[PDB]
Amino acid sequence: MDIVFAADDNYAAYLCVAAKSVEAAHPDTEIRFHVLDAGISEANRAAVAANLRGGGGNIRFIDVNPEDFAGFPLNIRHISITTYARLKLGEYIADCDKVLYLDIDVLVRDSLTPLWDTDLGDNWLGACIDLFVERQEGYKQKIGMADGEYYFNAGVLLINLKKWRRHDIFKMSCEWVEQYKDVMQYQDEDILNGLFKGGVCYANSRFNFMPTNYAFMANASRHTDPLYRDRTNTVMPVAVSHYCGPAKPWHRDCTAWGAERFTELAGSLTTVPEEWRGKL
Ligand SMILES: O=c1ccn([C@@H]2O[C@H](COP(=O)(O)OP(=O)(O)O[C@H]3O[C@H](CO)[C@H](O)[C@H](O)[C@H]3F)[C@@H](O)[C@H]2O)c(=O)[nH]1
Ligand SMILES: [Mn+2]
């Protein structure tokens, strides 16, 4: 499968860890990494590729310009401008009709092929519902969504590239961001939801297990709709842990579930540059 990650120099070492976890979950699957590079040094991309299979044979860094999104709101502190690069997927990747976008702060624990094998038909993408946002009575509607349309998290995405390449997603994002600039609160996550509402395929929450999903394991469903309940019901085992929010598995005092696998994988790296010692 073709996996897509987006990062800048600051997250280079983390990109490496998330990347390796994907490989560990797919021992016999050919993982092709496409990285949206917003300023990763040559030393940093060299160390990354060095820690993966084939001495970094299945990874290509695609240069992107962070200044491109300079006008987009950046209210959430722990997130950098690089978060909006995914909006130009259709422009940065040609050799794929389908890719699976992953946030750097994810930890892939199980095969992703069941999610990958999803047939998105003519929809824009496949994604997991976001409970934290979905249960914030009245928000989803500020961006034009209906109670029946479900707000998804942009940390894990099966994108129908061929369809994306047909449209000018960056211009529609600009247009939308001008329409809902004084209300959106989740940035690129808002853009994607507004733009593709009503045309999204939903996947079980096992492919995007977040803190809110976890907390719910200790159950009360924002809806009665059988589809929603079916989707927001994680079918064990968790395939993707998404450390959504300010607390990351690489931080100090991380209490988030399964956060140990980060270290387990960090301590298994082939090459660790002196400058990475800290971060890990
Ligand atoms: O120093 C940084 C900070 C952010 N990033 C990029 O930004 C993504 C964005 O942020 P987090 O993973 O840190 O975001 P977070 O998951 O905490 O929060 C929520 O809001 C985000 C947007 O503001 C996304 O929609 C995200 O999927 C959603 F869960 C990272 O994966 C990465 O691609 C970097 O490369 N370096
Ligand atoms: Mn994230």
Contacting residues for 272 by C-beta, under 8 A, at least 6 apart: 47, 280
Residue 115 has phi, psi (to 5 degrees) of -75, -45
Q: Which atom of ligand 1 is nearest to the CA of 7?
A: 35
**CB crowding 59-88: b at 16 or more within 10 Å, else e:** bebbebebebbeebbeeeeebbbbbbbbbb
Domain 1-280: assigned CATH number: 3.90.550.10
| 79, 89, 129: residue to mutate for ligand 1 pocket, most atoms within 8 A of CB | 79
Q: Name which of 217, 210, 218, 214 is nearest 248 in CA terms.
A: 210
**3 state SS of 227:** helix
Q: Residue of the nearest CA to atom 16 in ligand 1?
A: 244
What tokens appear for 72 in the block? 């987009």
Ligand 1 midpoint to CA 224 (Å):
30
Ligand 2 midpoint to CA 263 (Å):
18
Question: Considering Cα of 63, then 66, then 72, then 75, what sign does the dihedral take?
Answer: positive
**3 state SS of 164:** helix
Q: Which atom of ligand 1 is nearest to the CA of 189?
A: 25
Question: What count of other Cβ atoms lies within 10 Å of the Cβ of residue 261?
Answer: 16
Instruction: Kindly list the protein residues whose Cβ atom lies closer than 6 A to any atom of ligand 1.
Output: 6-8, 10-11, 76, 78-80, 82-83, 103-105, 153-155, 186-189, 244-245
End-to-end CA distance of the chain: 28
Ligand 1 midpoint to CA 61 (Å):
18
Q: Name which of 164, 171, 156 is nearest 202 in CA terms.
A: 156
d(CA 95, CA 162): 10
Q: Which atom of ligand 1 is nearest to the CA of 154?
A: 27
Question: How big, in percent rounded to 5, are the helix, strand and coil portions of the chain?
Answer: 40, 15, 45
Q: Name which of 57, 80, 81, 61 is nearest 69 in CA terms.
A: 81
Chain mean position to CA 280: 21
The domain spans of the chain are 1-280
Ligand 2 midpoint to CA 62 (Å):
20
User: What secondary structure letter does DSSP report for 209?
Assistant: B
What residues pair up with 243 in beta bridges, in sequence order?
none
Q: Name which of 173, 49, 156 is nearest 103 in CA terms.
A: 156
At how many degrees (to 10) do helices 12-24 and 42-50 cross? 20
CA distances from residue 109 to 132, 142, 187, 202, 237 in whole angstroms, order as listed: 22, 35, 27, 20, 8
What tokens appear for 58 in the block? 């299945």
CA distances from residue 16 to 46, 52, 143, 212 in whole angstroms, order as listed: 11, 8, 35, 26
What tokens appear for 84 in the block? 């909006």
